[PDB]
Write a protein that binds this ligand. Structure first.
Ligand SMILES: *C(=O)[C@@H](N)Cc1ccccc1
Lengths: 136, 122, 38, 119
RNA sequence: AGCCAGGAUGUUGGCUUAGAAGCAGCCAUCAUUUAAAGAAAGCGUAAUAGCUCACUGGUCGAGUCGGCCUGCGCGGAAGAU
RNA sequence: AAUUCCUUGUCGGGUAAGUUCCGACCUGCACGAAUGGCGUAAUGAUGGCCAGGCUGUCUCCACCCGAGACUCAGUGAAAUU
RNA sequence: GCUCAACGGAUAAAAGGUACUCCGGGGAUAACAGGCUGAUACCGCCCAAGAGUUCAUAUCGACGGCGGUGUUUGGCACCUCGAUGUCGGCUCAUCACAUCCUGGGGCUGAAGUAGGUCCCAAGGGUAUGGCUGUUCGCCAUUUAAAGUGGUACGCGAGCUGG
RNA sequence: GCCCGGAUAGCUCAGUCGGUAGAGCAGGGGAUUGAAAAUCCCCGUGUCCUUGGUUCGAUUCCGAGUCCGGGCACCA
RNA sequence: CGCGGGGUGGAGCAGCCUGGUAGCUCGUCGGGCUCAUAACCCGAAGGUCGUCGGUUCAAAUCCGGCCCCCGCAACCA
């Protein structure tokens, strides 16, 4: 659920995850889940974390997912020895680093948002915190 | 001392003839039955008229036993051959209506009421 | 009484107390809400 | 409506029922539960399933019996092990289609209440 | 905080359900009587009645409250001589 | 199936209960006609199964008979390090 | 004038078997146990959609999340090639507790009897047979129960040899 | 439990970016026969698995559920 | 899993190796012959070439992936 439509290449290096996040400030909406942690969010986790969140404000209200998967995480099969080629792709994941804003919300009461998130937070690998759009 | 296996002759009619113990009911690892202990039974021979047919599984009071029985004075009965009367599997109570040969005085009890009332001796 | 690791209140009547080192919810209202350990 | 009881697609007229439709889901998902506990394990995987018309409102299944097959290979190469397990799978697909299931006195006890004494 | 009181009217809000009367569900949630009282925070009823909290009066006479950022701690925490 | 992996296939027989044994079914992974096909009385220190008899194989081991073991005198090794 | 392409090109010219084996070496390198690891497994726990006549938490609990133990399958090749003999059965065992029975308690959709379920507790106890090499399992009839694990998947200078 | 595709007339099934749904067969009729099969012809006789939502409008879209097929994992 | 052969009118096969062109038998449709049906004689219609996205002046063909089909391998412990 939710992965790039196409890619210039199929696989990718393990990389590293140092440094503070970029899009640290809310804009698309009012309320927002800032990170505080460091880690990853497999494309499922950003999903199941969403369904918990959409099901609270119900049909009313709106939501923006600031982050997207776009990183392959390949794996070897079950009980096979090392090293006959890089393992084939399994599940996409989006790296996130501290200060990253994971979700946003609009035409909703502030107190329905602290709850709308707090449910969503329980479904996620990383630590999180509620935050506001700010006058600037 | 009756034990598993161990063919038993049957005292009552009901077409039993030859018979074989398959379990000694009572407790864990219980070994021996005699006197009038209840046990499992499985038929082997059986008469054609059949009050009960071959291959049945049942219960039975051990009655006569070759090893005999003692009692307080040190006296010792010892019948030539082992014998048991059949019992209905759920209701107990002998399914027969006659008893052949002596049974011991020890057998006496409430549930074994119907047997001692029958049979030629003791 | 349920053990559980995250105790917390249920009924408004639930109480929360710290006997020994252990934590314990206590609702005189509904008996089901007793809880140890948290 | 009627609530027929299938067994590997062999509908059984003996277990037919008549119940108000809202009641059916419980009588539905329950009647299979007696069958699940008293149909002996079979050499191929089974499919008890109460259903109205062709529509199926309930299902339970008995499990396969299966030889261990792997209990022998222990060199640890996998490809050498999928070969065995592949037969275990390919052949159950055949045994499943011939199927057929004798059902003696079960169409009776408990299924006709008399699962308690004195019975 | 405790103890003494009031906790009302429109009105069974609208439907939907045999019943929907603050309270089974769905949409709504204004208006009057005022010290003050939600078309209702729980208990309650087959359905009503019934009992509370919310808000107000009274005594009461000295601080009370809920979050934030940080130090250190407590539960989470089961293994084989 | 001395051949059939899946397989303890499925049906019947024997058994209180039978992955083996017997008769069948035919979906023969992967029978077949002188690297012979199907039968066949007698024969087998050949393979598998069942029954009567007999019992210390066993439930469960008890005693006794002799040669060792053990003590006394004579002779006097070995592997090993 | 070479596809001498095994592309610094051993010859103008060349394939298989070995369980009938043989010698020199190797723990430089595999099969068993050990070690590190913990993907796989097993066991808990956080969140609570759903089932439960209404009733998220008596009973279950999806997707997603964080852990523990070192039973299975595995990884890596650290220890042993200068012979260490691998499942199961027998015999005798021994520790763990994540307890099958027995014992003490909270909750229960617990009237009673009988149960379900988590907390506490390791003193004692824990089935015989049929088939199969089987441990397992299915069946037979018992029992207060027929616990799950380690111990070189205990135990061959103690037996067995299927 | 996951993954992919499904649930449309009595039965086997085609279709949908969001625009008043169909086919063979069964059933019921017509034509034909002195009437009978057979054959040709004609009618759909559905709340698009069930339950809530959004849309002017839902068989499509969304939520929850009960299910069907195949592929992994469990399955002496 | 590892190699290699294959998806083409309603059916069974050529065409591809050698990018510019799709062919055979059957059946389907119409017309004949017969009292009528088969056969039989004449004419005709019928194909996203398994999908996808790429080299291309141009793709059934060429090279990549995904989807079933079939064949072979999976050994010493
Ligand atoms: C059945 O054959 C196996 N699943 C059971 C088993 C095999 C090996 C070891 C322990 C149990």
């Amino acid at each position: 659920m939710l992965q790039p439509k196409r890619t210039k290449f199929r696989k990718m290096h393990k990389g590293r995850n140092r440094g503070l996040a970029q899009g640290t400030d809310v804009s698309f909406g009012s309320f927002g889940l800032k990170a505080v942690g460091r880690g990853r969010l497999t494309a499922r986790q950003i999903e199941a974390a969403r369904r918990a969140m959409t099901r609270a404000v119900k049909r009313q209200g709106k939501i923006w997912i600031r982050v997207f998967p776009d990183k392959p995480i390949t794996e070897k099969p079950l009980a096979v020895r090392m090293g006959k080629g890089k393992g084939n792709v399994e599940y996409w994941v989006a790296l996130i680093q501290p200060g990253k804003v994971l979700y946003e919300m609009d035409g909703v009461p502030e107190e329905l948002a602290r709850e709308a998130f707090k449910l969503a937070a329980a479904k996620l690998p990383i630590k999180t915190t509620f935050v506001t759009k700010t006058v600037m | 001392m009756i034990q598993e296996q161990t063919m038993l002759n049957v005292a009552d009619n009901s077409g039993a003839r030859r018979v074989m113990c398959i379990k000694v009911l009572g407790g864990s690892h219980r070994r021996y039955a005699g006197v009038g202990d209840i046990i499992k039974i499985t038929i082997k021979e059986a008469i054609p008229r059949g009050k009960v047919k071959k291959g049945d599984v049942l219960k039975a009071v051990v009655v006569r036993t070759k090893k005999g029985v003692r009692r307080p004075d040190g006296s010792v009965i010892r019948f030539d051959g082992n014998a048991c009367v059949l019992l209905n599997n759920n209701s107990e109570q002998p399914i027969g209506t006659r008893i052949f040969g002596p049974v011991t005085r020890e057998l006496r009890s409430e549930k074994f009421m119907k047997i001692i009332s029958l049979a030629p001796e003791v | 009484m349920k053990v559980r690791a995250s105790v917390k209140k249920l009924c408004r009547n639930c109480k929360i107390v710290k006997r020994d080192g252990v934590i314990r919810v206590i609702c005189s209202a509904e008996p089901k809400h007793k809880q140890r350990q948290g | 409506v009627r609530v027929d009881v299938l067994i590997n697609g062999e509908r059984v007229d003996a277990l037919a029922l008549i119940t108000h439709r809202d009641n059916s889901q419980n009588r539905g998902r329950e009647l299979v539960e007696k069958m699940k506990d008293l149909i002996p394990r079979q050499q191929f995987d089974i499919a008890i399933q109460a259903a109205i018309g062709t529509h199926i409102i309930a299902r339970s299944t008995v499990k396969q019996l299966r030889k261990n097959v792997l209990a022998k290979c222990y060199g640890g190469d996998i490809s050498r092990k999928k070969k065995l397990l592949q037969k275990q799978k390919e052949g159950k697909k055949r045994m499943k289609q011939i199927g057929n299931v004798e059902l003696p006195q079960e169409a009776f006890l408990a299924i006709l209440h008399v699962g308690k004494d004195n019975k």
